[PDB]
A and B are shown apart, each in its own frame.
With several copies, the nearest count.
Chain A
């Protein structure tokens, strides 16, 4: 496509170091989305300096990598899409576009195996998908309001977190006949599993507070506005990068104390991604069309 719309929604670095980009036009005559690949991460967001590019019918609310080839997309159309890079990694081709949600698909998360996924929607439902058969295995109306975030477990394929505007955080486990479990203030907005402890996770609220939760609690006032995301570093003892609507980025330690603070962004900070190659490198995209690269003081 000749252009990528100013609202950059998702930034995801793969294993080798390429950058995945999801963006939508949330204003203007056309409300559509686009998927882009940047083998040169420092080129981004230059539409001409890209490796691969594609345009979706509707906006991109969220996305994730399906290994190193495919991309799972949560669209405003109510459909879940899968787009796999070709043999040369220059074209992006659609495999499935399944409209199962009666409203905007807001969050997406791939389950440990890599063959299954969990979609969270504004239609209140949660769906567990089989990527190979291209069908939904199960549909769960456990929440009362819109689903804000779904976070599949790092190591358990039947475990995944959920949080909604109904003030609930649910711990899932498909093995139980009543799979959800309420864990616990202000509305939950972001969910991040700890990559070393499959029993600890962090959640960020609408009042800017980020909190530490052990399944069997610690809190800090990071931002002045809603916490849009929480992403852990690839480090053996990770750092936590907290995105926000107050246009700032912060990197916190194990006790939730602030180390980094970046005001580089002039609009909402949507996604963050740490470099597989340089663990002191964090990339943050935003609604101001910036692809800012950060050097975390380690």
Chain B
């Protein structure tokens, strides 16, 4: 249930050690590819001419074992950032040697340490190896939660441990990593191996690692408190951290000697089994974590059958649609008018008939008379509709194969029902679709939904920022991938400020010269130090009175699978200090053919205006 590995600096017999490690219960071994104490010379004689083999042989293990069980380790004497010139030059050649020796064996990952503020030459040498040869290896940077200088025992008479509280100073190891990956151009091959210490730092320091590519978690044996029966366990503060890392599916690493004279691995498995069972949304979205998809345009495109099927497999949203119609029937037709009044219900954008069926179920429980119309422009869905109307519905449902904005209806409607909302509410163009169907609504008719509002919250996710970069394509703008929204189940991320409302649409629209174009400015108070990469978009909708749907995390309709958050990215990440406000601007723009969004950050610093005039992204009308 947990992918785990053992970290060692002593492997006398590579095959014996691996056998013992696997028998212990591990899945991989972190061992040095050269003897850790074997300092080598590459410049001056006669140590440079050192004869004999330089390390053990590749033949000692099969290609599968080298590719699946061995995570290499950089030799501890390799100091590319030394103040001594000879040590730097020596360590440069020495570093390339071990990386190229690990590439030679096809090792799945290779560990390099970050234990000081200046790792410029370390980064240079790594960047240069990444651009040399036919690679694939992952590079895990071993970086501690707390610097070893900030966790030393206060036992130096003339150098006491500074007892002052430094909020930003406590987060020095994150800047070690931040600066290192900036130098290396956010290479998708450089990930974090976060070293957990004896006493956990302040929660802000821990929160600094949210949205970072943590691939491994290093738990040293010395952090395990021994229990009553003499077995290793962890504090409830440490346990909570383990539970946060289990969501990111990191590989647990156990380093150091046995101090409970395995049990550490068994304790991790016990913890893994004692986590809450995943809810419906959680079990559905598994697989889609941080996977960027294109937002659907059901107006411009005809949705596939298998797509309509998944939108129909959302019971919560259809039970909420039914009860909204149920309440509107009662509030419109009093019990004395029970059979004298027939309500004209038009399902605009009917799909393969799930709203039409909900409209029917809502008439049986509200016991009122309804006359249905199922308008739909996708002719393929219309086939499913016309076969439903023949086999079950009959004269009650009048199938209309047209665009709701073109349709010349026979009579006006009492209730127009629709499911035209995207993850950013108005992104599938409901404001234009229901505006075009407003003339055939009674001067007292009800639209379901009657209101919808989009939300935005600033986020940090170098994992998602890196994923948006990967979306560069040929024959287009090299930066277009940053000027378009993405539907994504955000997961390895940090939300830097609570969602605020963005754009609001109401139906029907009685405003004199309404206009669907928008411009909104939002100010986000940021309580932490961070790097802004994008803006999560969410939505809320009022179907009827207290019957609502929501994808805003704090008011999420439980068990509602039908939507994932949208992601509005920015070309360049923006450093934000604690206390600073992130000021974003969003526009909803349009012409007779297209609808698009534009957005710019104006604080703490300006960004470029993203998607000016829909050059990267438009929604088709």
Contact = CB atoms under 8 A, between A and B. Distances in A.
B149 A144 contact: yes
Contact of A100 (B57, B148, B257): B257
A102 B257 contact: yes
Contact of A176 (B44, B53, B84, B157): B157
B364 interface: no
A206 B38 contact: no
Given A100-B257, A102-B257, A31 B153 contact: no
Contact of B12 (A31, A101, A182, A226): A31
Interface string B596-615: 00000000000000000000
Contacts of B159: 182
Interface stretch (A56-64, A127-135, A151-159, A232-240): A56-64
A57 to B, nearest CB: 6
B10 A180 contact: no
B35 interface: yes
B37 A28 contact: no
Contacts of A123: 256
B46 A182 contact: no
A121 B404 CA distance: 44
B53 A207 contact: no
Contacts of A140: 153, 155
B157 A76 contact: no
B47 interface: yes
B149 A245 contact: no
B8 to A, nearest CB: 9
Q: Is the interface of A mostly helix, strand, loop or mixed?
A: loop
Interface residues of B, number: 54
State which size class the interface on A falls in: 35 or more
Contacts of A225: 44, 86
A104 B37 contact: yes
A78 B257 contact: yes
11 contacts: A26-B37, A28-B52, A28-B56, A29-B57, A59-B37, A61-B37, A144-B152, A178-B154, A182-B156, A266-B46, A287-B50
B115 interface: yes
B240 interface: no
B136 interface: no
B47 A245 contact: yes
B168 interface: no
Contacts of A85: none
Interface of B: 9-14, 35-39, 41, 44, 46-47, 49-50, 52-57, 60, 76, 82-84, 86-87, 115, 147-149, 151-160, 220-222, 255-258, 387, 390-391
A15 interface: no
A297 to B, nearest CB: 24
A280 to B, nearest CB: 27
A123 to B, nearest CB: 7
A49 interface: no
Interface string A1-30: 000001100000000000000001011111
A104 B9 contact: yes
A27 B35 contact: yes
A133 to B, nearest CB: 16
Given A141-B152, A224-B44, A247-B46, A99 B257 contact: yes
B9 A103 contact: yes
B77 to A, nearest CB: 9
Interface of A: 6-7, 24, 26-32, 57-59, 61, 75-79, 99-104, 122-124, 140-146, 166, 170, 176, 178-182, 186, 206-207, 224-226, 245-247, 266-268, 287
Contact of B36 (A76, A166, A268): A76
Contact of A144 (B39, B148, B390): B148
A142 B153 contact: yes
A30 B157 contact: no
Nearest to B512: A224
Contact of A26 (B38, B41, B49): B38
Nearest to A57: B12
A102 B47 contact: no
Contacts of B41: 245
By Cβ-Cβ distance, the 9 closest A-B pairs, closest first, are A102-B256, A26-B38, A144-B149, A26-B35, A99-B257, A180-B156, A76-B10, A266-B46, A77-B10
Nearest to A78: B257
A31 B57 contact: no
B53 A27 contact: yes
A288 to B, nearest CB: 8
Contact of A102 (B53, B86, B255): B255
Contacts of B83: 186
Nearest to A77: B10
Contacts of A99: 257-258
A120 to B, nearest CB: 14
Contact of B46 (A142, A179, A267): A267
Given A27-B38, A29-B387, A141-B151, 5 more contacts: A27-B35, A32-B12, A58-B10, A123-B256, A245-B39
Given A104-B37, A268-B47, A27 B52 contact: yes
A28 B387 contact: yes
Contacts of B87: 206, 226
Contacts of A247: 46-47
Contact of B148 (A61, A103, A124, A176): A124
Given A57-B12, A123-B256, A27 B55 contact: yes
Contacts of A176: 157
B36 A170 contact: no
B158 A181 contact: yes
A27 to B, nearest CB: 5
Contacts of A7: 38
